[PDB]
Amino acid sequence: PAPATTFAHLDATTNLERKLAEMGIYPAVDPLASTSRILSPAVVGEEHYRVARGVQQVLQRYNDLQDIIAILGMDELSDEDKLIVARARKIQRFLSQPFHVAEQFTGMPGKYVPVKETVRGFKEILEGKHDNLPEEAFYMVGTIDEAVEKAKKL
Amino acid sequence: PAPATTFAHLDATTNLERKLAEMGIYPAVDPLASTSRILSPAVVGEEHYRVARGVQQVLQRYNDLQDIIAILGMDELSDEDKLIVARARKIQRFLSQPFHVAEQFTGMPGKYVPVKETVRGFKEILEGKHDNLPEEAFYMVGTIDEAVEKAKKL
Amino acid sequence: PAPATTFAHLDATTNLERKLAEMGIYPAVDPLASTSRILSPAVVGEEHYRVARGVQQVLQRYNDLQDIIAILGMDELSDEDKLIVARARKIQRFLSQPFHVAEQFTGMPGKYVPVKETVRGFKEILEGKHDNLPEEAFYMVGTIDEAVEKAKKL
Amino acid sequence: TVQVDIVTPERKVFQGEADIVIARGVEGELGVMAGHIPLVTPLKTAPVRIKQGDKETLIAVSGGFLEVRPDKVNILADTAELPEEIDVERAKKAKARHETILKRLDKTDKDYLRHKRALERAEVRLQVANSK
Amino acid sequence: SITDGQIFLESDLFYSGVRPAVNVGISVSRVGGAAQIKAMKKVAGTLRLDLAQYRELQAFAQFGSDLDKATQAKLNRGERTVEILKQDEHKPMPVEEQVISIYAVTNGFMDDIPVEDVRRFEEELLSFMRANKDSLLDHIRQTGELPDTKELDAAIEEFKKGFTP
Amino acid sequence: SITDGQIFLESDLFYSGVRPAVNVGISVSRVGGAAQIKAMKKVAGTLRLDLAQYRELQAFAQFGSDLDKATQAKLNRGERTVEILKQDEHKPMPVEEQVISIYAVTNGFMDDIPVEDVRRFEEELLSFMRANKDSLLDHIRQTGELPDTKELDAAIEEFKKGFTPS
Amino acid sequence: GMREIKRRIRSVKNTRQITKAMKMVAAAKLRRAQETAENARPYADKIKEVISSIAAGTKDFSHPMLEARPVKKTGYMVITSDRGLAGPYNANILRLVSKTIEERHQSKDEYVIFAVGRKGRDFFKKRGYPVVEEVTGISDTPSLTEIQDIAQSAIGMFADETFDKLTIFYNEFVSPIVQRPVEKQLLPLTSEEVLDGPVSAYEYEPDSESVLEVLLPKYAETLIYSALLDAKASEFGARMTAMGNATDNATEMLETLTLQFNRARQAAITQEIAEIVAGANALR
Ligand SMILES: Nc1ncnc2c1ncn2[C@@H]1O[C@H](COP(=O)(O)OP(=O)(O)OP(=O)(O)O)[C@@H](O)[C@H]1O
Numbered sequence A, B, C: 001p002a003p004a005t006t007f008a009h010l011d012a013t014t015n016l017e018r019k020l021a022e023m024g025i026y027p028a029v030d031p032l033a034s035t036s037r038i039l040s041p042a043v044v045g046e047e048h049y050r051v052a053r054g055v056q057q058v059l060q061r062y063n064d065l066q067d068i069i070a071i072l073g074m075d076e077l078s079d080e081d082k083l084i085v086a087r088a089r090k091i092q093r094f095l096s097q098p099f100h101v102a103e104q105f106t107g108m109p110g111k112y113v114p115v116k117e118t119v120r121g122f123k124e125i126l127e128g129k130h131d132n133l134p135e136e137a138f139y140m141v142g143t144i145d146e147a148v149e150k151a152k153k154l
Numbered sequence D: 001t002v003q004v005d006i007v008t009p010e011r012k013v014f015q016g017e018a019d020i021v022i023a024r025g026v027e028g029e030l031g032v033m034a035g036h037i038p039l040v041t042p043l044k045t046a047p048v049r050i051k052q053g054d055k056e057t058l059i060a061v062s063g064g065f066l067e068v069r070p071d072k073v074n075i076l077a078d079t080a081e082l083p084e085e086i087d088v089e090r091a092k093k094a095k096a097r098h099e100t101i102l103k104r105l106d107k108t109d110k111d112y113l114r115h116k117r118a119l120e121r122a123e124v125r126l127q128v129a130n131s132k
Numbered sequence E: 001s002i003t004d005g006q007i008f009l010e011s012d013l014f015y016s017g018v019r020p021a022v023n024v025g026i027s028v029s030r031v032g033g034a035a036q037i038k039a040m041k042k043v044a045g046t047l048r049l050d051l052a053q054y055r056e057l058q059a060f061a062q063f064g065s066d067l068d069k070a071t072q073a074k075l076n077r078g079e080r081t082v083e084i085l086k087q088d089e090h091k092p093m094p095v096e097e098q099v100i101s102i103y104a105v106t107n108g109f110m111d112d113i114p115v116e117d118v119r120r121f122e123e124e125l126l127s128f129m130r131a132n133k134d135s136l137l138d139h140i141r142q143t144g145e146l147p148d149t150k151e152l153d154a155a156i157e158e159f160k161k162g163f164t165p
Numbered sequence F: 001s002i003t004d005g006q007i008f009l010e011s012d013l014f015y016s017g018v019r020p021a022v023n024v025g026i027s028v029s030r031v032g033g034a035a036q037i038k039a040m041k042k043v044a045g046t047l048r049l050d051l052a053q054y055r056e057l058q059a060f061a062q063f064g065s066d067l068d069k070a071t072q073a074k075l076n077r078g079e080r081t082v083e084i085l086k087q088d089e090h091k092p093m094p095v096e097e098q099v100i101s102i103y104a105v106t107n108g109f110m111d112d113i114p115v116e117d118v119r120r121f122e123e124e125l126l127s128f129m130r131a132n133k134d135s136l137l138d139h140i141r142q143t144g145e146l147p148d149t150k151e152l153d154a155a156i157e158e159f160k161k162g163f164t165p166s
Numbered sequence G: 001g002m003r004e005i006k007r008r009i010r011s012v013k014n015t016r017q018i019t020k021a022m023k024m025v026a027a028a029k030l031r032r033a034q035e036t037a038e039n040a041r042p043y044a045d046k047i048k049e050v051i052s053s054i055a056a057g058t059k060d061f062s063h064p065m066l067e068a069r070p071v072k073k074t075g076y077m078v079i080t081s082d083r084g085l086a087g088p089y090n091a092n093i094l095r096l097v098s099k100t101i102e103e104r105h106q107s108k109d110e111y112v113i114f115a116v117g118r119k120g121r122d123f124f125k126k127r128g129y130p131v132v133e134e135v136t137g138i139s140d141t142p143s144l145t146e147i148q149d150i151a152q153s154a155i156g157m158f159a160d161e162t163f164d165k166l167t168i169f170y171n172e173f174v175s176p177i178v179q180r181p182v183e184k185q186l187l188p189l190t191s192e193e194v195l196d197g198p199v200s201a202y203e204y205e206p207d208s209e210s211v212l213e214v215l216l217p218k219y220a221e222t223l224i225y226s227a228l229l230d231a232k233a234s235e236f237g238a239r240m241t242a243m244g245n246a247t248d249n250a251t252e253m254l255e256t257l258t259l260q261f262n263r264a265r266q267a268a269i270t271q272e273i274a275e276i277v278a279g280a281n282a283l284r
């Protein structure tokens, strides 16, 4: 009865997962388990919704192949799946972000990324525009432009 | 407490179970939990009793295997059990029957089956005479003859 | 609350369980739940303690596999586990014992088994010395020698 | 030099360039060097010795046959084992078994040939394991 | 809900020979590394990840030598660290000796040794470190830091050559 | 036990994108065809039972091209009717337009069309029926009966010739 | 009652960890079985090359193994698994053997069976089929030597005339989801399929007729081995998908068991309290 009654009032969930924190993905928000009632075309645009569902489809597929990859290796996957795994790994890193409140500990500047830019960035990764940037480029950056800039330094 | 106390006042019971209804077995009668004071050789005659107990033995065995079946399916079973499960499933379907009052829901005409025919049908299934008819043949029929007739249309 | 509070007042416990009684294991003593303050190398000596812990390890492992065996079956266990299950079942039977006072119920004469012999018997079962005696041999006997003798009658 | 591939039906066992390949053919020893004439012959259950200058790797081939083309040399055996990967104590159990059975079998008994064959497979494995 | 963590003990663990019977997965210290000397915080880092991998892969332990060599080694490391965390009753260990023992097993120095010998290996190792290499132990008691890893690796490998399985 | 039937909505369906997420197996109307215009009672007659069988048989659908041709066709019809019964929020449909859409899919008129195109096919079909074949739609609003099935089949096949798949 | 459901959840949850893993091991072994088949295919193609070269330079070419006879008796090889937990893998292949023997032969005298794998021989022996030779305990991902004695004696029986046709029933691999039971002829061979290979100039020691006497039985041998490796891939595909389903069915049952456990948990607390409060209200 306690959580059941609390749940009737929730609009959204943010599920922090230790597995992601251990990989170095901060904030360690589970991008599949977290949910919101207002991730709908009615509220965020049509484009936002399409992109977010696209991102989740790619991550979900990658999640399903985790066992298959570990045993059968990467030669066993179809060409469609190998491309999805490539993007999933970039997506997973681009969801990480340095925080202003960690500026003292990381020693790196934090980043505020507006929604328009978040949507644009993930749209482009899904579209294939950054399939040739190395993976580390997307890790701990703000906008997609900062990822392109970080690639030059590597 | 309500139904539990009600049982003491009854000479026969028909115990309807939702699991059967959800499978499409109508009427949804638990053939092991249902009981009658007059299911004895003295009243229904020696053949009836023998057949009914035969049917219940087969269903009871099938009931016991329901955990193993729910996970592994039928593939791991001994040859003795696979034959019992085959017959149990035919028996379970032949206990279903279209109702005159349900012509509005089922769209099928109802059937009245006299006791002589009911006993004869289940006797034959237990004897192995219809081990080669497909399972759907026994579902929603009437006499054993209607099951043989339905098999031809499949 | 009654038995739960009673535990605090005891230096040794003998926990009788119905599951064992239903198998025919008398006395029906849970060999994992029963405990004693003096089951330590300091009091019973180093060999006794080692054997007792050995027995409990084998029984615990068997307990864990009971679920797996019931569904996936005994052929799919490793060679190490099948040997543990074999011994566990012999151990479980050798813990049973006919009582002097129970000559009416068992129908057999009772047996007093000194500690030295109890330790010796279970030590030998763990060591593998009786892996080819049938299970019934260990059931309702006193010393390990009576089990060897009972095997000949089978 | 010439390229050699010794192969069982499951894996490739030895691969490389080689100065010469000493192999006990069924009609007598053969030394296959570069430019040898195209040839196919069954081999006896024996070692095959492969020379690379100062180095000599020895392989326990059984039930094999040799195929030389102008360019390369293939040996396709049922069995082929390198010295370091031969189980020495198993080769002695294989030997002991088939040796004591051979002692008492009649010389055209049903299985005489099979146990003679299995004895030689183990005899060769013991030599090859010593070249380590 | 009041305390800063909990140590859960289980009967299944106890009777299987894991004593003290600490469920390491479910038990928690909310204070964590703050309550640990730097040496222990360093070596325990790897113990936790080793056992987390062990507990996931434990289903595959009846398939011995069917498994690929990566998972085989993870199971072998796991059973050995479990043996290290077993501990006799009324026999507390100084933190400096714990750090060495955990360092040994987590850096692979017991991978060559039978699982049944691990606990005796530890007892024999520490009596060796106390008698002969006390300068290394003392570094930890004073600084709270690990000694120089090259000196420490050498001293363990020195001990190893006098150990008979 | 009080009401005259129920509409059960299931989470697994909902979050997989079947919206409205009606569990066809459990749901029911005790009033049934009595509460339906004759056109809809005709086209829908077995629809519930057809989809309940689809959803059961969908579990064993991994065998594309290997599975027998009877069950293959049932799965292909099923995925298409599922797409028809998806429906966006705050977009109610007139009964006459529902009957045409359900008629189309249940008589096979979308069997050669990709599953991903079915929803656009429907939207394009109905805007065609409204603009050009309104006499057929109007028959249903007035009589409550289906129009002449031969005229209706022709009108859909007419639309089909101007439809570009992907 | 929670006493049962505590333990029933325990059972299903442990069991699911094992089915989950078993699919992962079956998945590993399918890779190793297809790896080793990619060595067996060129090994057998090379033997085929040498055989098609010797036939291409003998003027009159014929062998007993390529010569079709009147079928006096027949030999049947049947490949099945040793272990189960592989769905209907063994059922399907054995039903096909049962069917094709019912259609053809009217008594036990007309055919004779080589049972590869325990499931097969147990089936056939129980029903008194003419099982003339057997092999069990074949290793997962096996070498040719493990099939050799039963291949050689089966070729031996055709090489004389104990029977005049040798045939092999196994589950043909397609995907990890699909495995079709099939029958294939081994002997007599068909020169249409044994001679289509690259013809080359070789010297033969002692001579060409002598090396052809070792290679042709050595080739039939490898067909039986290829069928075993396809049959092993089919075993491990069938097991992947059977334990896959058992894992999913276990999670499904864990939902309905969790639902029951929590009804019971909640009802215990609810009902216990009402009792405590009813007792206290009889005094207050
Ligand atoms: N002594 C050995 N050491 C390592 N591998 C061996 C040894 N003997 C055989 N093998 C391998 O095991 C398989 C069996 O080969 P084969 O049947 O020719 O041997 P065998 O003499 O029958 O073996 P054994 O009699 O010892 O069982 C092959 O894959 C082979 O390479």
Ligand SMILES: [Mg+2]
Residues within 6 Å of the ligand: G145
């Ligand atoms: Mg051998």
